[PDB]
Amino acid sequence: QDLYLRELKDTKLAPSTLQDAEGNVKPWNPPQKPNLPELELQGPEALKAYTEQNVETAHVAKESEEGESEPIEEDWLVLDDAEETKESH
Amino acid sequence: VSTLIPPKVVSSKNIGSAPNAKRIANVVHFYKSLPQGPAPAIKANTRLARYKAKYFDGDNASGKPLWHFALGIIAFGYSMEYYFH
């Protein structure tokens, strides 16, 4: 149909100008290529953790806590304390 | 804090210091006890002891055990009056 074919033409070659050709758009002043492709590509990381989300900051798992291998001082006091607690058993 | 030995502290003190003292008195009391009423030593007889272990013995402990003294003293005193009066 002419109304279909003409619509397809005006909506395809112009769609070519918008997307399929890097001619941006004459009717609209700011091209989306200088707006979306790189800066708004940081919009994904603007919503994400910037230079940190894609990066995934290095955080190595640490060691758990222990008694510093100290039986010279902790063992005797622990024994006395446990025996004192045993006085009401 | 971390692992320990809450039960193993029975080393530093045995359970029941007062029960331990009571049981230590019990050991000395029961051990140093006769097997079955041992060491009786009842019989005795030497001049007067033949009367002591017989007449002062608690098998009877009736009234005649003292009355033997009265009868004997009366025997002595009758002769005392005979030699005196």
What does this molecule look like?
This is part of a larger assembly, with chains A (89 residues) and B (85 residues). By secondary structure, chain A is mostly helical. Chain A is 40% helix and 0% strand. Chain A has three helices and no strands. Chain A has helices spanning 2-20, 43-47, 74-85. Chain B has 85 residues and is mostly helical. Chain B is built from three helices and no strands. The radius of gyration of chain B is 31 Å and the shape is rod-shaped. The chains are: A mainly alpha (89), B mainly alpha (85). Chain A binds chain B through residues 66-67, 78-80, 82-83, 85-87, 89, and chain B through 1-2, 4-6, 8-13, 15.
- Largest beta-sheet characterization of chain B: none
- Count the helices of chain B. How many? 3
Structural class of chain A: mainly alpha
Strand content of chain B: under 5%
- Beta fraction of the residues of chain A? under 5%
Protein topology:
This is part of a larger assembly, with chains A (89 residues) and B (85 residues).
Chain A: H1 2-20, H2 43-47, H3 74-85
Chain B: H1 17-31, H2 49-55, H3 64-84
PDB class: membrane protein
Keywords: yeast, mitochondrial
Entry title: Yeast ATP Synthase in conformation-3, at pH 6
